[PDB]
Amino acid sequence: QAREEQRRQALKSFISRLDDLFNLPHQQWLPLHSGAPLGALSPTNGRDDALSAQEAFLAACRLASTRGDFQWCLQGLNLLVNFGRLRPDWELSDRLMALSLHCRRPEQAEQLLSAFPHFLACPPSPVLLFTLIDEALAAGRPQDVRRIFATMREQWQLALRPAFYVAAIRAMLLLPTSADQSLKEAQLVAEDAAALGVPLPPVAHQLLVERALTLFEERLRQADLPGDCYTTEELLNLAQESHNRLLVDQARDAVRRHISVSELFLWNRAPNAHLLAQAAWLQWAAERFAERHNADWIQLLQQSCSASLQELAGGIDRGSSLHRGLPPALLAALIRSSDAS
Amino acid sequence: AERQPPRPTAAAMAQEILKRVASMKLPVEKDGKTHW
Amino acid sequence: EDIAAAFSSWTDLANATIDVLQSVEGMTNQQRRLIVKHVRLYNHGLWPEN
Amino acid sequence: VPPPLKSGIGEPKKTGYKFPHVFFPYKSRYRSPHRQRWWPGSAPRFLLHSHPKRWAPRRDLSFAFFAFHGLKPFAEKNLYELMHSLPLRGASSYFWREADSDPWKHLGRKANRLQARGVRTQGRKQLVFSPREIYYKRRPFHALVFGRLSVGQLGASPPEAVPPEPERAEKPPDCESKEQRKCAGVS
RNA sequence: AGGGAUGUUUAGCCGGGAAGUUAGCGU
RNA sequence: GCGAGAAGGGAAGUGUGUUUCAAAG
RNA sequence: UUUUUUUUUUUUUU
């Protein structure tokens, strides 16, 4: 009964008792502030010697760890507001957000983000907002992370972050929809990340999008489907476009992160070979006809044949992307073309 | 006066059209003055 | 429509006196005082475009 | 019957009087200057009866309960409430008053008064407010906002907008104009 | 290594108003 | 913001009233 | 001295 009796009794009394206090005149109410400053016996005396209204309410909120007590805490909050004894601050917004979470009430948490700026000064902590995104993913509901992202983005108060853009992308590709439908929605968020201040996503962003891009329809259209497309132009065009976006982004990222027959691999210093994997893809054609349609990679793939890059005797990359290759795009691709041939 | 003259023009050029746009104010709205 | 039915043309309305207006049953005190004000303003051209 | 008297938020508990006024039993035609305004076709006293204490069962309590002010209708949203949700607290923006949907102008006992012109048988120059300094005492319905008041000309577009004015400097940054109703701005 | 770090209570006089109080002769 | 006892007989005997004069906040 | 402020002001030492 240590977790049931001693827990409910302590919280019930604290709020009940507090209510009665307010009934007395203002002369018997708790001070707003902790204490007087130095301006108003050693300097350590005073300052922090009295219990504030705010401090008492937040102290009793540490007892909740169930859904039943979550409602109870709200009761106390209202009292302060109605009596004009609440001072919004950074701390206030932080604990409130977290209190819902600790009570196993994710539903209520989301509501806060759309109702904080109406009655509060400071926004919640960035950490908290990010953590709630993973909550939905663990339960298996990737469709509930689209509305939360938009509200944050639209809001001006909250500072824009590059990291925040990663979560969104990752969650959309896991939706339980068709291959073409899932990718189409993901591209919309990507696009949005290039207009408003031309944000630069991390280096490990373009890789993910590109992985599935040239695998879900491109690869599929030349393996079993053309047995003896409707957006073939867009798929190919977007493939290369993605790559381009990465180049521009990565170059500008290094300047602010840490204030840094024909070939061009003779006097090019020692760059990272990790990126050459995606750029080494051979362009077959726009259409099925690979011989009569299009007339415009070995030398590119000669840098790493045995799956051994110039890592041990080359340069060092900071916060690089996945080192691994394309199992579902390289291993099963070349073999088929050869073995079957 | 040596290096005194160049400063105020630099701040004036960077100065916005508006005087002071105080979006957020913690204390009570007032105005202080001195008499040397 | 009841008030308009009693009258025949505009001439009979502009030149209508106060006693004649009381004969009609479909006319209250508020309506009577309002109609007399409009006819007096249009005749003098005081209400072309307020 | 009249609504019971209630105290607004941010006020200590008071002691209710036994009679509405001194001449309760003796006289009946006398009326107090601070009489409540609840009959349809009137407006509240701003900071006397506009925001009475709000209470609800434990079950109904939630985050959304606190956000009632910010979701009020257009016909009851004041300046204070409007500026709270705008970027930068509505700073560096323009505001104007639209006197077209007042409660007394459509409904009320004296809703058929005789005007000097009579009846309405059928681009304007509306004032513009530029909030400079913002200070919130009792959020979200209380603040001491100081801004520059000027005149501006409306456009020919379907909605009420402000083309290339404000033009004239009327007065230095002063107190707000009105606290009844306000509109958005271009910013 | 940024999903980091940093931020936290301002002071005195006078005038008017509401609730509680309505005990004082020590000047 | 301004006006509102416009429905008052409850008090008083040397009082309430009347008369003669005076009054540049 | 304590809640309320759409009636104010003041703060330095060669």
XYZ file of C-alpha atoms (C1' of nucleotides) in Angstrom:
680
model
C 0.000 0.000 0.000
C 3.080 2.187 -0.091
C 2.451 3.209 -3.693
C -1.315 3.599 -3.444
C -2.249 4.882 -0.026
C 0.725 7.075 0.796
C 0.608 8.539 -2.752
C -3.085 9.494 -3.104
C -3.454 10.726 0.473
C -0.485 13.072 0.238
C -1.642 14.692 -3.035
C -5.328 14.925 -2.099
C -4.643 16.819 1.093
C -2.116 19.179 -0.453
C -4.533 20.574 -3.064
C -7.524 20.537 -0.696
C -5.673 22.426 1.991
C -4.267 24.966 -0.421
C -7.733 25.932 -1.556
C -8.750 26.964 1.926
C -5.738 29.231 2.188
C -6.954 31.487 -0.584
C -10.159 32.180 1.310
C -8.240 34.294 3.828
C -7.449 37.951 3.047
C -4.373 38.937 1.071
C -2.508 39.686 4.316
C -2.292 35.940 5.067
C -1.427 34.796 1.531
C 1.975 33.533 0.475
C 4.478 35.981 -1.023
C 4.802 36.208 -4.779
C 8.570 36.309 -4.670
C 11.047 34.278 -2.657
C 12.308 37.323 -0.896
C 13.726 40.790 -1.008
C 16.992 41.563 -2.816
C 20.188 43.004 -1.420
C 19.008 46.432 -2.270
C 16.186 46.395 0.179
C 23.839 40.703 8.468
C 25.943 39.175 5.680
C 24.673 38.908 2.078
C 23.711 35.222 2.330
C 20.952 35.956 4.857
C 17.540 36.263 3.345
C 16.970 36.242 -0.362
C 15.691 32.679 -0.290
C 13.882 32.250 3.027
C 10.184 32.022 2.178
C 7.864 29.732 0.243
C 6.297 31.188 -2.896
C 2.932 30.350 -4.408
C 4.518 28.999 -7.545
C 7.039 26.907 -5.647
C 4.362 25.156 -3.568
C 2.234 24.229 -6.597
C 5.147 22.807 -8.606
C 6.430 20.897 -5.547
C 3.172 18.918 -5.239
C 3.215 18.061 -8.976
C 6.157 15.635 -8.459
C 3.832 13.024 -6.834
C 1.816 12.168 -9.997
C 2.779 8.952 -11.918
C -0.717 7.764 -12.982
C -3.525 9.224 -15.123
C -5.866 9.826 -12.176
C -3.558 12.394 -10.537
C -3.034 14.306 -13.796
C -6.499 15.868 -13.551
C -5.934 16.812 -9.943
C -2.838 18.835 -10.791
C -4.825 20.978 -13.247
C -7.061 22.028 -10.393
C -4.279 23.796 -8.651
C -3.150 25.596 -11.736
C -6.505 27.237 -12.215
C -6.395 28.641 -8.717
C -3.217 30.573 -9.358
C -4.378 32.014 -12.640
C -7.767 32.999 -11.300
C -6.147 34.698 -8.284
C -3.359 36.254 -10.280
C -0.408 34.523 -8.746
C 1.211 32.850 -11.757
C 4.360 34.153 -13.482
C 5.002 32.454 -16.844
C 8.635 31.524 -17.404
C 10.921 29.086 -19.161
C 10.569 26.635 -16.316
C 6.801 26.748 -16.266
C 6.492 25.695 -19.872
C 9.016 22.916 -19.429
C 7.522 21.121 -16.441
C 3.937 21.326 -17.715
C 4.814 19.626 -20.963
C 6.661 16.861 -19.179
C 3.984 16.344 -16.529
C 1.523 14.988 -19.097
C 4.091 12.612 -20.510
C 5.021 11.174 -17.132
C 1.323 10.364 -16.544
C 1.112 8.227 -19.745
C -1.130 10.691 -21.578
C 0.399 11.440 -24.981
C -2.924 12.700 -26.262
C -2.908 15.685 -23.951
C 0.691 16.542 -24.720
C -0.035 17.389 -28.332
C -2.759 19.849 -27.323
C -0.268 21.911 -25.369
C 1.754 22.810 -28.436
C -1.358 24.411 -29.981
C -2.457 26.217 -26.804
C 0.725 27.447 -25.069
C 1.127 30.795 -26.830
C -2.285 32.038 -25.736
C -1.602 32.107 -22.014
C 2.168 31.679 -21.625
C 5.226 33.821 -22.269
C 8.034 31.426 -23.003
C 7.795 28.325 -25.203
C 8.548 24.761 -24.110
C 12.033 23.287 -24.211
C 13.189 22.026 -27.622
C 14.169 18.687 -26.152
C 10.660 17.846 -25.046
C 9.122 18.538 -28.430
C 11.525 16.172 -30.186
C 10.995 13.431 -27.635
C 7.232 13.383 -28.244
C 7.842 12.545 -31.914
C 9.500 9.246 -30.963
C 6.560 8.370 -28.708
C 4.180 8.039 -31.621
C 6.685 6.037 -33.680
C 7.164 3.487 -30.890
C 3.407 2.896 -30.591
C 3.204 2.388 -34.364
C 1.364 5.512 -35.551
C 3.492 7.357 -38.134
C 0.420 9.284 -39.351
C 0.189 11.392 -36.168
C 3.596 13.073 -36.650
C 2.481 15.204 -39.623
C 0.248 17.671 -37.764
C 2.747 18.179 -34.932
C 5.531 19.176 -37.335
C 3.491 21.722 -39.248
C 2.460 23.661 -36.134
C 6.056 24.002 -34.950
C 7.287 25.137 -38.327
C 4.539 27.678 -38.828
C 5.152 29.250 -35.423
C 7.627 32.132 -35.420
C 8.404 32.110 -31.726
C 10.194 28.804 -31.865
C 13.604 28.869 -33.518
C 13.998 26.717 -36.606
C 16.286 23.699 -36.297
C 17.947 21.541 -38.979
C 17.791 18.319 -36.954
C 14.034 18.534 -36.715
C 13.758 17.969 -40.445
C 15.274 14.511 -40.205
C 12.601 12.937 -38.054
C 9.795 13.954 -40.362
C 11.343 12.355 -43.410
C 12.117 9.112 -41.644
C 8.593 8.776 -40.286
C 6.842 9.298 -43.636
C 8.721 6.526 -45.463
C 7.457 3.995 -42.886
C 3.771 4.749 -43.478
C 1.597 1.694 -44.312
C 0.741 2.828 -47.843
C 1.720 2.065 -51.425
C 5.301 2.508 -52.603
C 4.383 5.452 -54.846
C 2.070 7.078 -52.282
C 4.568 6.997 -49.402
C 7.383 8.534 -51.456
C 5.170 11.261 -52.941
C 4.250 12.649 -49.515
C 7.871 12.527 -48.333
C 9.078 14.647 -51.262
C 6.734 17.470 -50.230
C 8.547 17.941 -46.913
C 11.931 17.848 -48.651
C 10.920 20.580 -51.034
C 9.685 22.737 -48.198
C 13.197 22.677 -46.755
C 14.669 24.706 -49.599
C 12.532 27.850 -49.917
C 12.098 29.524 -46.560
C 15.655 30.678 -45.849
C 17.053 27.768 -47.949
C 17.793 25.557 -44.924
C 20.689 23.102 -45.153
C 19.804 19.575 -43.984
C 22.504 17.316 -42.520
C 24.724 15.283 -44.876
C 22.815 12.117 -43.903
C 19.538 13.307 -45.447
C 19.743 13.010 -49.201
C 20.956 9.439 -48.932
C 17.728 8.147 -47.475
C 15.505 9.730 -50.073
C 17.709 8.554 -52.901
C 17.825 5.008 -51.611
C 14.161 4.307 -52.151
C 13.827 6.610 -55.129
C 15.731 4.482 -57.601
C 14.599 1.214 -56.082
C 10.841 1.372 -55.816
C 9.971 2.205 -59.445
C 13.228 2.554 -61.368
C 14.564 -0.857 -60.506
C 11.156 -2.474 -60.644
C 10.465 -1.309 -64.186
C 13.352 -3.293 -65.709
C 13.322 -6.561 -63.771
C 9.930 -8.271 -64.053
C 7.349 -5.679 -65.091
C 8.405 -5.294 -68.775
C 7.543 -8.900 -69.577
C 7.299 -9.764 -73.260
C 5.819 3.844 -66.842
C 3.760 6.993 -66.248
C 6.340 9.170 -64.445
C 9.633 7.884 -65.853
C 10.769 11.418 -66.721
C 10.215 12.664 -63.160
C 11.966 9.745 -61.440
C 15.204 10.120 -63.390
C 15.113 13.890 -63.242
C 14.586 13.905 -59.468
C 17.379 11.368 -58.956
C 20.054 13.712 -60.180
C 18.366 16.713 -58.622
C 18.645 15.170 -55.161
C 22.356 14.699 -55.582
C 22.824 18.295 -56.605
C 21.053 19.545 -53.526
C 23.460 17.588 -51.382
C 26.546 19.136 -52.901
C 25.454 22.686 -52.292
C 24.255 21.870 -48.810
C 27.333 19.973 -47.709
C 29.723 22.692 -48.909
C 27.865 25.400 -46.950
C 27.498 23.140 -43.886
C 31.263 22.700 -43.359
C 31.788 26.498 -43.291
C 29.431 26.939 -40.289
C 29.595 23.569 -38.473
C 33.313 23.717 -37.703
C 34.485 26.836 -39.647
C 36.566 24.939 -42.266
C 38.243 8.911 -70.893
C 38.064 12.249 -69.034
C 38.585 12.183 -65.264
C 39.422 14.616 -62.484
C 40.971 12.254 -59.913
C 44.641 13.082 -60.559
C 45.104 16.282 -58.584
C 41.874 16.427 -56.587
C 43.442 16.024 -53.167
C 41.948 13.139 -51.143
C 38.182 13.615 -50.898
C 35.680 11.211 -49.370
C 34.824 8.241 -51.589
C 31.597 7.509 -49.753
C 29.604 9.787 -52.014
C 30.773 8.137 -55.243
C 28.477 5.150 -54.641
C 25.344 7.024 -55.642
C 26.997 9.046 -58.443
C 28.379 5.856 -60.078
C 24.921 4.710 -61.231
C 24.723 4.117 -64.991
C 21.935 5.925 -66.833
C 20.158 3.278 -68.917
C 17.313 5.186 -70.574
C 14.094 7.071 -69.974
C 12.059 4.244 -71.465
C 12.236 0.479 -71.746
C 14.179 0.822 -74.962
C 17.762 1.151 -73.709
C 19.362 0.936 -77.143
C 17.290 3.080 -79.510
C 16.161 5.884 -77.232
C 19.070 7.071 -75.147
C 22.711 7.427 -76.173
C 24.034 9.707 -73.457
C 30.660 4.122 -64.986
C 33.524 1.547 -64.759
C 36.180 4.305 -64.407
C 34.061 5.744 -61.565
C 33.705 2.352 -59.797
C 37.473 1.635 -59.953
C 38.009 3.595 -56.694
C 36.472 0.790 -54.574
C 36.085 -2.656 -56.122
C 36.469 -4.931 -53.120
C 34.316 -2.851 -50.809
C 37.433 -1.193 -49.407
C 37.599 2.603 -49.441
C 40.592 4.850 -48.782
C 39.730 5.181 -45.108
C 42.775 3.735 -43.401
C 45.186 5.751 -45.589
C 43.075 8.751 -46.558
C 41.026 11.537 -45.137
C 38.746 11.699 -42.130
C 35.087 12.706 -42.366
C 33.111 14.429 -39.585
C 29.500 13.316 -39.144
C 29.417 11.339 -42.396
C 26.493 9.314 -43.720
C 26.076 5.555 -43.754
C 29.313 3.834 -44.745
C 27.578 0.738 -46.028
C 26.429 0.243 -49.560
C 23.146 -0.529 -51.241
C 22.375 -4.186 -50.488
C 18.941 -4.009 -52.069
C 20.229 -2.078 -55.048
C 23.755 -3.293 -55.793
C 24.079 -6.854 -54.620
C 20.950 -8.119 -56.318
C 21.292 -5.834 -59.327
C 24.644 -6.695 -60.875
C 24.340 -10.438 -60.225
C 21.062 -10.646 -62.061
C 22.398 -8.788 -65.058
C 25.359 -11.154 -65.226
C 24.198 -14.553 -64.081
C 21.065 -14.476 -66.169
C 22.858 -13.015 -69.156
C 38.974 64.095 -31.619
C 41.293 61.223 -32.589
C 38.973 58.167 -32.488
C 35.847 59.770 -30.962
C 34.205 61.196 -34.124
C 33.949 57.914 -36.204
C 31.764 55.871 -33.774
C 28.274 57.569 -33.743
C 27.885 57.603 -37.575
C 28.572 53.846 -37.616
C 25.710 53.212 -35.170
C 23.430 55.669 -37.011
C 23.827 53.803 -40.322
C 23.049 50.465 -38.621
C 20.115 52.060 -36.779
C 16.674 51.061 -38.016
C 13.953 53.444 -39.133
C 12.048 52.873 -35.936
C 13.251 54.206 -32.596
C 12.785 51.236 -30.315
C 10.560 48.206 -30.934
C 10.142 46.668 -27.474
C 8.175 43.511 -28.184
C 8.676 42.181 -24.662
C 8.947 44.225 -21.456
C 9.210 42.646 -18.012
C 9.086 45.769 -15.803
C 6.381 48.448 -15.789
C 6.352 50.915 -18.700
C 7.962 54.268 -17.571
C 10.629 56.839 -18.453
C 13.649 57.989 -16.434
C 15.522 61.282 -16.724
C 18.538 62.982 -15.175
C 19.681 66.566 -14.541
C 23.430 66.250 -14.831
C -48.199 45.870 -48.577
C -51.268 46.883 -46.550
C -50.223 50.538 -46.299
C -49.342 50.756 -50.000
C -52.691 49.223 -50.993
C -54.672 52.053 -49.383
C -52.883 54.743 -51.398
C -53.302 55.075 -55.165
C -50.292 57.091 -56.379
C -47.442 59.179 -54.977
C -49.428 62.429 -55.143
C -51.973 61.168 -52.599
C -49.145 60.175 -50.227
C -47.003 63.328 -50.298
C -50.052 65.581 -49.828
C -51.563 63.323 -47.146
C -52.460 65.198 -43.962
C -52.215 63.898 -40.392
C -55.933 63.261 -39.805
C -56.284 61.182 -42.978
C -53.367 58.942 -41.969
C -55.197 57.940 -38.771
C -58.094 56.336 -40.666
C -55.993 53.344 -41.739
C -55.805 50.650 -39.061
C -52.432 49.310 -40.215
C -50.376 52.223 -38.893
C -48.829 52.488 -35.430
C -47.449 55.563 -33.673
C -43.861 54.679 -34.594
C -44.720 54.166 -38.273
C -46.836 57.329 -38.527
C -44.096 59.637 -37.232
C -41.535 57.957 -39.513
C -43.477 58.387 -42.768
C -44.141 62.102 -42.243
C -40.405 62.703 -41.766
C -39.410 61.105 -45.085
C -41.918 63.010 -47.233
C -40.826 66.330 -45.704
C -37.144 65.683 -46.502
C -37.545 64.515 -50.108
C -39.782 67.466 -51.003
C -37.098 69.927 -49.859
C -34.306 67.860 -51.424
C -32.691 67.211 -48.037
C -32.310 63.436 -48.604
C -30.901 62.909 -52.113
C -27.880 60.992 -50.820
C -27.262 61.033 -47.069
C -33.704 37.414 -13.556
C -30.362 39.248 -13.502
C -27.136 37.217 -13.485
C -25.400 36.804 -10.113
C -22.473 39.100 -9.396
C -19.054 37.519 -9.912
C -15.493 38.721 -9.385
C -13.003 38.823 -12.227
C -9.769 36.890 -12.390
C -6.953 38.379 -10.416
C -9.056 39.832 -7.670
C -9.323 38.731 -4.023
C -12.580 37.434 -2.602
C -14.995 40.195 -1.574
C -18.008 40.367 0.738
C -21.364 40.555 -1.014
C -23.742 43.323 -0.001
C -27.220 42.646 1.365
C -28.950 45.198 -0.896
C -28.122 46.521 -4.377
C -28.213 50.135 -3.164
C -29.065 52.273 -0.150
C -32.604 53.102 -1.332
C -33.598 49.476 -1.810
C -36.837 49.358 0.240
C -37.919 53.001 0.046
C -37.238 54.115 -3.525
C -37.516 52.110 -6.744
C -36.851 54.463 -9.692
C -33.332 55.349 -8.518
C -30.515 53.649 -10.433
C -26.856 53.256 -9.461
C -24.159 54.595 -11.820
C -22.262 51.270 -11.660
C -25.260 49.176 -12.734
C -24.473 45.957 -14.575
C -24.903 45.794 -18.360
C -26.232 42.335 -19.252
C -29.426 43.034 -21.210
C -29.023 42.369 -24.958
C -27.804 45.415 -26.851
C -25.090 46.710 -24.521
C -21.382 46.268 -23.781
C -19.491 45.238 -20.633
C -17.554 47.558 -18.331
C -14.208 46.284 -19.572
C -12.443 45.626 -16.298
C -15.477 45.334 -14.048
C -17.641 42.593 -15.621
C -16.058 41.105 -18.746
C -14.018 38.129 -17.508
C -15.691 36.634 -14.419
C -14.199 33.688 -12.545
C -14.411 30.467 -14.563
C -14.936 27.106 -12.859
C -15.675 23.594 -14.095
C -15.576 20.012 -12.778
C -12.296 18.158 -12.513
C -13.292 16.068 -15.497
C -13.673 19.069 -17.784
C -10.316 20.615 -16.873
C -7.716 20.534 -19.636
C -5.215 22.583 -21.586
C -7.872 23.703 -24.034
C -9.833 25.212 -21.129
C -7.176 27.891 -20.601
C -7.172 28.839 -24.284
C -10.743 30.175 -24.318
C -9.661 33.810 -24.640
C -7.670 33.220 -27.789
C -10.584 31.440 -29.502
C -13.216 34.125 -28.871
C -15.406 35.278 -31.784
C -14.421 38.201 -33.961
C -17.210 40.246 -32.418
C -15.729 39.898 -28.908
C -11.949 39.636 -29.463
C -10.136 42.698 -28.115
C -6.678 43.991 -29.021
C -4.945 42.336 -26.110
C -6.214 38.909 -27.036
C -5.350 39.373 -30.690
C -1.759 40.477 -30.270
C -0.900 37.548 -28.028
C -0.885 34.983 -30.822
C 0.629 37.064 -33.628
C 4.339 36.834 -34.429
C 6.493 38.971 -32.183
C 3.477 39.791 -30.063
C 2.071 41.673 -32.961
C 4.901 44.103 -32.924
C 5.801 46.138 -35.973
C 2.288 45.687 -37.344
C -0.831 47.714 -38.123
C -4.266 47.560 -36.528
C -7.604 49.288 -37.101
C -11.122 49.241 -35.709
C -14.083 48.107 -37.825
C -17.313 49.566 -36.413
C -19.694 47.483 -38.504
C -20.812 44.587 -36.303
C -21.514 46.174 -32.926
C -24.090 44.421 -30.704
C -26.155 47.600 -30.313
C -26.100 48.308 -34.069
C -27.959 45.072 -34.908
C -29.738 44.007 -31.706
C -31.056 45.692 -28.577
C -34.058 47.492 -27.164
C -33.048 50.846 -28.690
C -32.095 49.331 -32.047
C -34.468 51.530 -34.081
C -33.431 55.039 -33.043
C -34.007 57.970 -35.394
C -30.715 59.350 -36.708
C -30.073 62.872 -37.965
C -30.103 61.599 -41.567
C -32.882 59.014 -41.312
C -32.212 55.570 -42.786
C -29.236 54.273 -44.762
C -30.489 53.896 -48.342
C -27.132 52.634 -49.663
C -12.486 53.958 -50.105
C -12.440 55.271 -46.571
C -9.816 56.826 -44.276
C -9.540 54.667 -41.148
C -7.036 55.173 -38.364
C -4.072 52.807 -38.032
C -2.317 51.762 -34.826
C 1.366 50.741 -34.742
C 2.228 49.037 -31.422
C 5.806 49.854 -30.409
C 6.126 48.922 -26.745
C 4.119 46.042 -25.268
C 3.731 45.274 -21.546
C 1.415 42.519 -20.335
C 0.044 42.742 -16.771
C -2.773 40.180 -16.717
C -2.460 37.935 -19.770
C -4.161 37.453 -22.219
C -6.672 40.283 -21.794
C -4.616 43.004 -20.131
C -1.609 44.995 -21.308
C -0.128 48.515 -21.548
C 0.660 48.809 -25.247
C 2.233 52.058 -26.508
C 2.126 52.814 -30.187
C 2.023 55.453 -32.865
C -1.454 56.489 -34.021
C -1.820 57.658 -37.629
C -4.355 57.881 -40.467
C -4.485 55.598 -43.484
C -6.577 55.159 -46.614
C -8.321 51.910 -47.481
C -8.098 50.095 -50.819
C -10.615 49.051 -53.459
C -10.121 45.315 -52.801
C -13.092 43.247 -51.574
C -11.688 43.043 -48.055
C -10.681 45.932 -45.808
C -6.972 46.550 -46.502
C -4.455 49.461 -46.259
C -2.661 50.539 -49.519
C 0.241 53.198 -49.429
C -0.641 55.131 -46.295
C -0.120 55.761 -43.293
C 1.182 59.118 -44.592
C 0.860 61.806 -41.880
C 2.449 61.801 -38.431
C -0.497 62.520 -36.134
C 0.940 62.192 -32.606
C 3.925 60.550 -30.898
C 3.595 56.994 -29.538
C 0.684 57.073 -27.102
C -1.795 54.763 -25.415
C -4.188 52.592 -27.378
C -7.338 54.062 -28.922
C -10.032 51.479 -28.371
C -10.387 48.177 -26.523
C -13.606 46.821 -28.015
C -12.738 45.214 -31.355
C -9.768 45.130 -33.717
C -8.779 43.617 -37.055
C -5.605 42.156 -38.512
C -3.009 43.920 -40.586
C -0.643 43.614 -43.500
C 2.596 43.804 -41.551
C 29.846 15.795 -30.249
C 24.446 21.911 -30.964
C 19.045 16.746 -28.961
C 25.005 21.184 -26.053
C 25.513 25.540 -23.204
C 23.733 30.054 -21.368
C 18.831 32.540 -18.777
C 15.824 32.748 -13.122
C 13.664 37.247 -7.021
C 14.885 45.349 -8.793
C 14.378 49.445 -4.718
C 11.854 54.053 -1.917
C 7.935 58.287 -1.089
C 3.138 60.550 -1.721
C -2.581 60.558 -3.248
C -7.131 57.906 -4.157
C -10.267 52.852 -3.904
C -12.238 47.421 -1.990
C -12.223 43.269 1.964
C -10.771 42.258 6.805
C -10.137 45.243 11.117
C -13.250 49.017 14.061
C -8.405 46.874 20.333
C -5.188 52.384 21.599
C -6.026 57.621 25.667
C 0.924 55.468 26.719
C 1.400 62.811 23.474
C -21.233 62.116 -19.948
C -25.790 65.036 -17.975
C -30.826 65.211 -15.225
C -33.976 62.711 -11.528
C -37.883 63.287 -3.608
C -41.119 66.673 -9.439
C -45.796 60.064 -5.940
C -42.828 63.638 0.886
C -47.568 66.254 6.315
C -43.135 62.288 10.135
C -40.492 67.186 13.709
C -41.589 72.358 16.016
C -45.198 77.558 20.128
C -42.973 81.717 20.643
C -41.771 78.127 16.418
C -43.395 78.112 11.380
C -44.837 82.589 8.643
C -45.500 87.935 7.438
C -43.288 92.981 7.274
C -38.844 96.665 7.057
C -33.716 96.645 5.230
C -29.125 94.725 3.464
C -25.856 91.446 0.316
C -19.132 93.302 -5.992
C -17.187 84.004 -3.834
C 4.634 47.746 4.561
C 1.270 42.916 1.789
C -4.328 42.621 -3.258
C -6.064 46.512 -6.928
C -3.187 51.495 -10.774
C -6.277 54.438 -17.853
C -3.935 59.958 -11.159
C 2.927 60.764 -10.298
C 7.932 61.285 -9.381
C 12.853 60.264 -7.559
C 18.122 56.804 -7.579
C 25.738 59.197 -9.540
C 30.355 61.976 -5.605
C 36.660 63.654 -8.898
